[PDB]
Amino acid sequence: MLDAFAKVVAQADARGEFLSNTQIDALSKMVKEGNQRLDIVNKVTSNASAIVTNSARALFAEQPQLIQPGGNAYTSRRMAACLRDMEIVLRYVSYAMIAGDSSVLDDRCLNGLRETYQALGTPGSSVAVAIQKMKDASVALANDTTGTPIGDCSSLVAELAGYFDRAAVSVV
Amino acid sequence: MLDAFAKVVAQADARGEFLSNTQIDALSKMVKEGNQRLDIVNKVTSNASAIVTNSARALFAEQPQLIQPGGNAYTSRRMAACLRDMEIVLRYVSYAMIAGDSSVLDDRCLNGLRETYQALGTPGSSVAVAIQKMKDASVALANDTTGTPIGDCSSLVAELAGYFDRAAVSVV
Amino acid sequence: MLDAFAKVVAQADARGEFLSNTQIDALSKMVKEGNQRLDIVNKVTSNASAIVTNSARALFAEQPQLIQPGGNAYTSRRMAACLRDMEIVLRYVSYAMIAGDSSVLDDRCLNGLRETYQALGTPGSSVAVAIQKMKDASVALANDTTGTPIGDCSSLVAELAGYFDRAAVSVV
Amino acid sequence: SIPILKYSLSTQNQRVESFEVNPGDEQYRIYSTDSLPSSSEVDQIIWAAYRQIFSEHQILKSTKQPFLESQLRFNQISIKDFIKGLVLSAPFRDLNYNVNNNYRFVEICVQRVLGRDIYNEREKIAWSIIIATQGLEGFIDTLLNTQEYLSNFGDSIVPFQRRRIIPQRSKGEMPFNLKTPRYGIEFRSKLAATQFSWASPIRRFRPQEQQPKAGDPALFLNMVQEMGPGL
Amino acid sequence: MKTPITEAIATADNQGRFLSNTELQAVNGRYQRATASLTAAKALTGSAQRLITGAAQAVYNKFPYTTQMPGPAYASSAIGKAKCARDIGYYLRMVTYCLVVGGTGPMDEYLVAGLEEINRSFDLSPSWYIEALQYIKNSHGLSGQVANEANAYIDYAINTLS
Amino acid sequence: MKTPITEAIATADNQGRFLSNTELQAVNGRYQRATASLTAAKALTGSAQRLITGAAQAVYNKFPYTTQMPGPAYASSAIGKAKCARDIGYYLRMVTYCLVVGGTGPMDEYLVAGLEEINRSFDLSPSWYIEALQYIKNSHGLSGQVANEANAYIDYAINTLS
Amino acid sequence: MKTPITEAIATADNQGRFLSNTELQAVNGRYQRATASLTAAKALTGSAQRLITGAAQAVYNKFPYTTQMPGPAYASSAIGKAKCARDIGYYLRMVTYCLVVGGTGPMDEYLVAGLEEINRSFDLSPSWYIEALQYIKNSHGLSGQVANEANAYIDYAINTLS
Amino acid sequence: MKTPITEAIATADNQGRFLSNTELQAVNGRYQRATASLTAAKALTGSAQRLITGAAQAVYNKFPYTTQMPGPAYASSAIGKAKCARDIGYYLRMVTYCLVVGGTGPMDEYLVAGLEEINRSFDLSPSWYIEALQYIKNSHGLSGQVANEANAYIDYAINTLS
Amino acid sequence: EIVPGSYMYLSPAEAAEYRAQQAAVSQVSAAFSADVQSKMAQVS
Amino acid sequence: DKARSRSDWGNRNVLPASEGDAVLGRTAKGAVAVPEFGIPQLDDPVLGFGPDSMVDPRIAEADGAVWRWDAGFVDESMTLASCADISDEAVADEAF
């Protein structure tokens, strides 16, 4: 997989180049954000079961057909596999957040997921609503200031919510 | 796989219903003629080798181009594979006779079998002739009155004839 | 496998105790030794091909019966395995240097190595000679103050030499 | 005595060498009992074998085999017997064998036990008659006793998807659990409690997916949380 | 499903064998237990709503905090009381499904697989569902072998809940 | 072996499960069929002196070359005749074991396992043994379900010989 | 155990590798954060009895049926109250073991592996232990990156129970 | 890539887990080292052509037969000197990639994998490139922890050729 | 000894036959040493 | 509304469509914005990244533009490269 420092090395090599001082100076701007990026994945990991079950509870309150007899999240083995899917997607968005780009999310999670749900009969447009409810549960948690020094991590909030958007358009 | 009893249950669970009183009474009618159902698969199993080898012998008398050179049943390996295909299909019809429905016949035997014979170059219409030659051979045994109390099994024999007929249209 | 921090935890759980302040303050002394420990491991891993090759070449100089026709290092497939076996042991000694205790040297390298060498006919006393020639080739390198701040790290070279004696008495 | 029928090979990644001394982050984590693991590390061998044979979605409490686990912890069975014992287990027959036919069950067990894809369609046809004439217990024994299994995994390594990513690339072949789920487009129709087979995206009068434009004050919001110190 | 018909096919199927006389006796044993087993499944079907509402009231008497404590897991809402009686109807419907097929087939597939995972996620105590099943076990009013068949699957759900 | 009692234990043992109601009805189907099985085993045991030497002569009447042709595979000698009567006594004794046990368990592990290699090596034909087995099915002299249970294991031995 | 040092060795032994700068930097990140986590384990150890008796009382205020309901699972007797404060001490001790080691290794081996079969069998509720751990998170009195280290292992124990 | 970041994601994903503090400390140790490791890459890039044409001349001094002997494998032509200074710059550029990434990622993918098969086929002796890397190891001019980072990747390249 | 790792174990009769057959090729490397006197203008 | 909170990144807005709409500091994906070009090593026609040195295959998977769900993935099944050259005379005369 690639991280954000390995994505610039692969672009540079493909043209047989060194890295200029302008490119190095933009990679040490990525290092200085290093402790605020680690606080964001720590807040998502530490609350990871309340992200998943509060947003699954919300998903069936407003789409109650999914848990009725004949639905897809009916019959508790399929209920447990439904919550497994939300923890899986939340796991790889957490991986793509420390890496700095979404390549481990792209081929280990989302690659072939839209075509998997069509072979199972799972509503892939309702999985995207499940990802979108974990999106703002995780954003409201990362904007929350508890346990953190004063300062700024607002360009990183907009980045974490973009991996949740990538995961949600790849499944519809 | 399902039997006749779990077929009603799996259909009732997708509606979220209990079974009605006319569904329990239609199930207890299967129990009343359960001894005559077991006498049918006792006749078929006990002569299962003679059903296969007599109907295969009659298939090549009337289809003599299967065992000419170039034919699909010409070698030692292609001919013994024709005999075991008849013994597989005759085995999965008797699995559908004690179950009550053709759910083990469709899932384990007939699913994707027409496309397999098309990939092998096996003439699928002649496999249907061999299944129909096994149909009347085991119906003639099912109507035998030896070692049984005399009664009416004619609705059960017409069900066994429908399992061989389903296998013969699912293979061409 | 264990490190030195989990060695003192596996012993406190077996008596159901919290760690006392003396065991905590003995562990934080190991933390401030941590930069000097990473210097020793870096000094070995960057000279690893010359530790193996020189102490091999010094072994078949004083023991020419090993590489004479009929010896246990003749016929280059056996010569390639003698160089692999030297590299394996030096690899797992440097693993037990960052850990702080030889639990990774004991199980996944040294458990069953006297038994293996006796099965093949390898002279296990000659293996102990080769291990003690990579000991004083890397004790001499960890005492080299090239590119380090000049402080005192004599207690960790007496530790690194002990893992080489541990592997040398375990094959004879 | 009816030998297996001959099929043709195909070009795949694992048939050919990667010249990779010093593998990287896409090396796929050998789980072996040849490294003498402790109790905390034999739990990781067991979870890796459950994930490989079952899905991640079939590692429920009602699925785990507690007595096959304790014979591995006492060195009575090997990892090749753990992998065989998971395929002949009652959860695998119920959730996977009963909702596939004989041709799609071969390609599940080739992908998950041998760690490679099928060579062609005729390889599914060639192996599906080992199931129908000898059972699952005869099919998994003739699949674990091939030279493809004993050379790659031996009898003390958990299988893995062999050679999935090429060393330069960032996009590799699809993982075998996303490529082949529990049941396919047949058994989907009505045999697995299913309706309507597709769904349009959810409509709403509060749009929820508005893209920001070039003068929006949240793109400059950066240092809005707090001003930097100094003079 | 685990059914004495389908567990008899699936022992001849695993060896590629025809159904010998070993498996016809297993089907026969189902056919002469099915008379007492099918009357229990319709005596519980007709007496459903008496047994549902009484069993949910029996949980509320033993554990009265479940009607008072605020939060989504408890039946202290009008929504949570509806979801409680929905659950007792699931457990009672699976027992009547097991009696009409023989053996613990439908409740193994539809209820107990993944049951521990969803109890822990949604904070649902399995001691609640044991008390609701001890009510049904005492109050179905059946006797003879009709009560033996009924209590055989009530006790199965109790054994896997605890 | 392959008793319905041991094939119900080994079913529940391969699932790590206590004996549920799926297995107890398989056991009770053995007990219902048992009194028609243990009387056929009792009837063939006492009538074995007639049914063996009657069936040995039924082979020599259909295949008379097995008494005249020289060689070790044929019964043209007293050694070959006494080993031919020994072979029919193996088939009859295995049927009475399958009636006592119930199901084709004893004659699978004792008789049919590896038999095709024995007939092919020692040049002796399986069509000789089928004519002997059709004699015993025609002359055991039972009726009811005592004959229908006994003929179910003669017909299993014929279906393995062809 | 899973420590940051044994997870750097295992990823280097899997690749057949000497300890590169990928692995020396990872062990160096443990040594940097070990100053903040060795004072969290020293401050949680020294104030342990204040935290155990407090966190057991926080379960009794929140779920007061556990002191009133009769039975062996509940803290209604003096035996069942000392078994509760025993268990709170087990969870607090594993958190200090993870702070000195770094990484959730001691409680993955001593506590969480097999925990759900204990709570199911003895009818213990995992929401009793979440309420106890949420007291210790709010009452340990740490601040800065010392509280950040301690709360990261409290929340690991809650996520295995939730 | 053998980044400390992608090695942390891989150990978490091996066991299907979230990123705990075991893996966040490996990422943090990369950031503490990235200051000295990025000033080394800036100074090696700025002295690139000085170090490349110097190291090429040091190979022609120690191995003067490489400029005289005829054949395609040697630097005895104008094309062989252009392809020789191409290869010095390849080894220098991969070192600087490892300094901006952290850990021996780019050198393993782009340089070391397959190097032994190339140097055998085209008859390129690996002792030439060792002499060229020993020049850069002595002439980059850095000191402190900045040379300590730089030499750890010159030495890693020498151990692969040796 | 042939080379320091390759040897010939021969009887004392037949070890004379090994040495007196490579002195029987040492009289033809005394005869291709007159291939250096006719380096130029060989067959004219 | 216009993305104003950092709290509404999870609630309402998704991510910048084009890279001119990125956050203050970063690219469209969210990583830090680094200049694409470094110093070229070995400026040389025959040996060096000339104009016709063929593209890295690992430049797209490193981009993340090969995966269909990411915005960089352009599909060329409907672009002009997939249309037949009419100046080819084998294709004109057949299609006449």
Ligand SMILES: C=CC1=C(C)[C@@H](Cc2[nH]c(/C=C3N=C(/C=C4\NC(=O)[C@H](C)[C@H]4CC)C(C)=C\3CCC(=O)O)c(CCC(=O)O)c2C)NC1=O
């Ligand atoms: C062990 C794993 C591990 C972590 C979890 C982090 C934890 C961590 N974060 C910060 C430090 C910080 N963390 C934040 C982050 C935030 N503050 C806020 O108001 C926001 C709510 C939130 C961002 C979303 C800020 C703003 C700083 C310090 C200011 C700065 O570095 O410029 C520091 C101290 C660095 C310093 O002193 O400069 C540490 C150790 N680092 C690690 O190594």
Ligand SMILES: C=CC1=C(C)[C@@H](Cc2[nH]c(/C=C3N=C(/C=C4\NC(=O)[C@H](C)[C@H]4CC)C(C)=C\3CCC(=O)O)c(CCC(=O)O)c2C)NC1=O
């Ligand atoms: C476990 C082994 C086992 C079997 C192999 C079957 C076979 C079987 N069937 C019947 C019992 C019966 N069998 C038949 C069947 C038939 N009558 C006909 O005229 C047709 C030829 C044929 C149907 C095709 C009927 C009609 C009865 C009912 C008895 C009767 O009507 O008098 C009985 C006796 C029980 C009774 O008298 O009711 C037995 C042993 N049942 C078993 O339990």
Ligand SMILES: C=CC1=C(C)[C@@H](Cc2[nH]c(/C=C3N=C(/C=C4\NC(=O)[C@H](C)[C@H]4CC)C(C)=C\3CCC(=O)O)c(CCC(=O)O)c2C)NC1=O
């Ligand atoms: C990324 C990888 C990595 C490394 C390689 C080390 C590198 C390193 N070593 C030291 C610092 C040191 N390193 C050593 C070790 C030695 N000095 C000697 O004279 C001996 C030859 C050798 C021990 C046998 C000593 C002794 C000090 C402290 C100086 C002193 O008191 O003598 C320091 C300064 C911090 C401190 O003072 O502790 C650093 C960064 N750290 C890392 O993070």
Ligand SMILES: C=CC1=C(C)[C@@H](Cc2[nH]c(/C=C3N=C(/C=C4\NC(=O)[C@H](C)[C@H]4CC)C(C)=C\3CCC(=O)O)c(CCC(=O)O)c2C)NC1=O
């Ligand atoms: C070792 C145990 C053993 C036994 C207990 C006997 C039991 C026995 N006797 C006969 C068979 C017979 N049994 C009798 C006996 C009698 N008939 C009468 O009229 C009298 C009342 C009674 C004697 C007191 C007769 C007359 C025959 C038939 C002739 C014969 O077979 O010798 C048969 C074969 C017929 C059958 O039952 O199917 C058997 C098993 N034989 C044994 O091998």
Ligand SMILES: CCC1=C(C)/C(=C/C2=NC(=C\c3[nH]c(/C=C4\NC(=O)[C@H](C)[C@H]4CC)c(C)c3CCC(=O)O)/C(CCC(=O)O)=C2C)NC1=O
């Ligand atoms: C690591 C990357 C990865 C992903 C993402 C993944 C997804 C994945 N989800 C699956 C099933 C499932 N997914 C769902 C999910 C849902 N159903 C709904 O109604 C909801 C809308 C939704 C979530 C709440 C359900 C119910 C199943 C069970 C299908 C079945 O077996 O019936 C399956 C089928 C295989 C099986 O169940 O054994 C796969 C492969 N697998 C992977 O390996």
Ligand SMILES: CCC1=C(C)/C(=C/C2=NC(=C\c3[nH]c(/C=C4\NC(=O)[C@H](C)[C@H]4CC)c(C)c3CCC(=O)O)/C(CCC(=O)O)=C2C)NC1=O
């Ligand atoms: C789902 C249950 C199931 C069935 C029923 C099944 C059939 C099946 N029949 C096959 C072949 C075959 N089947 C036949 C049979 C016939 N051809 C004829 O001409 C006759 C009309 C007919 C005999 C009645 C022949 C000739 C082959 C191919 C043998 C060969 O190509 O060597 C094969 C290919 C395997 C092989 O080459 O041996 C399969 C998989 N497989 C299954 O998994």
Ligand SMILES: CCC1=C(C)/C(=C/C2=NC(=C\c3[nH]c(/C=C4\NC(=O)[C@H](C)[C@H]4CC)c(C)c3CCC(=O)O)/C(CCC(=O)O)=C2C)NC1=O
């Ligand atoms: C757990 C990690 C691990 C260890 C520790 C290990 C040891 C090991 N060393 C071996 C052989 C060997 N080891 C040597 C080494 C030597 N012989 C000498 O005379 C010298 C004194 C010495 C070299 C310095 C030789 C020559 C063989 C080959 C023996 C043979 O195949 O005949 C073999 C036999 C397999 C083979 O032939 O390669 C094993 C299993 N293997 C492992 O996987």
Ligand SMILES: CCC1=C(C)/C(=C/C2=NC(=C\c3[nH]c(/C=C4\NC(=O)[C@H](C)[C@H]4CC)c(C)c3CCC(=O)O)/C(CCC(=O)O)=C2C)NC1=O
């Ligand atoms: C057919 C197999 C099957 C089972 C067993 C099953 C259980 C089940 N019970 C649930 C909820 C629930 N169950 C209850 C029930 C109770 N709480 C109380 O206080 C009462 C004492 C008790 C009634 C006995 C409540 C209140 C919820 C809602 C929990 C929540 O929304 O977070 C949920 C969450 C989704 C929902 O239904 O809203 C599942 C999946 N679902 C299934 O498909």
Ligand SMILES: CCC1=C(C)/C(=C/C2=NC(=C\c3[nH]c(/C=C4\NC(=O)[C@H](C)[C@H]4CC)c(C)c3CCC(=O)O)/C(CCC(=O)O)=C2C)NC1=O
């Ligand atoms: C318990 C299971 C079992 C079976 C089934 C069995 C069969 C069996 N029959 C055999 C021989 C024989 N079987 C026969 C029998 C016959 N040939 C004829 O001409 C007659 C038609 C027919 C008698 C009805 C003869 C003549 C031999 C001797 C062949 C020889 O020794 O070469 C032999 C060779 C050893 C011997 O008995 O001398 C075996 C193993 N053995 C067993 O242990």
Ligand SMILES: CCC1=C(C)/C(=C/C2=NC(=C\c3[nH]c(/C=C4\NC(=O)[C@H](C)[C@H]4CC)c(C)c3CCC(=O)O)/C(CCC(=O)O)=C2C)NC1=O
């Ligand atoms: C180190 C890892 C570890 C854990 C986690 C552990 C838990 C554990 N808690 C137990 C019991 C118990 N735990 C409790 C605790 C409580 N019940 C209440 O009502 C209170 C609300 C709550 C206290 C907070 C009680 C009352 C029992 C006794 C249950 C019984 O005896 O039936 C038992 C049964 C045996 C015994 O201790 O007597 C185990 C094994 N044991 C371990 O070795």
Ligand SMILES: CCC1=C(C)/C(=C/C2=NC(=C\c3[nH]c(/C=C4\NC(=O)[C@H](C)[C@H]4CC)c(C)c3CCC(=O)O)/C(CCC(=O)O)=C2C)NC1=O
């Ligand atoms: C990015 C990683 C990478 C490396 C390391 C690499 C090396 C490399 N050097 C090569 C050739 C060469 N390399 C040299 C270099 C030298 N010969 C000498 O005498 C000098 C002493 C020495 C210069 C130090 C020469 C003369 C050739 C041409 C050999 C031939 O074409 O047969 C070739 C054959 C193709 C070619 O470039 O012409 C490769 C693949 N290629 C790569 O892609």
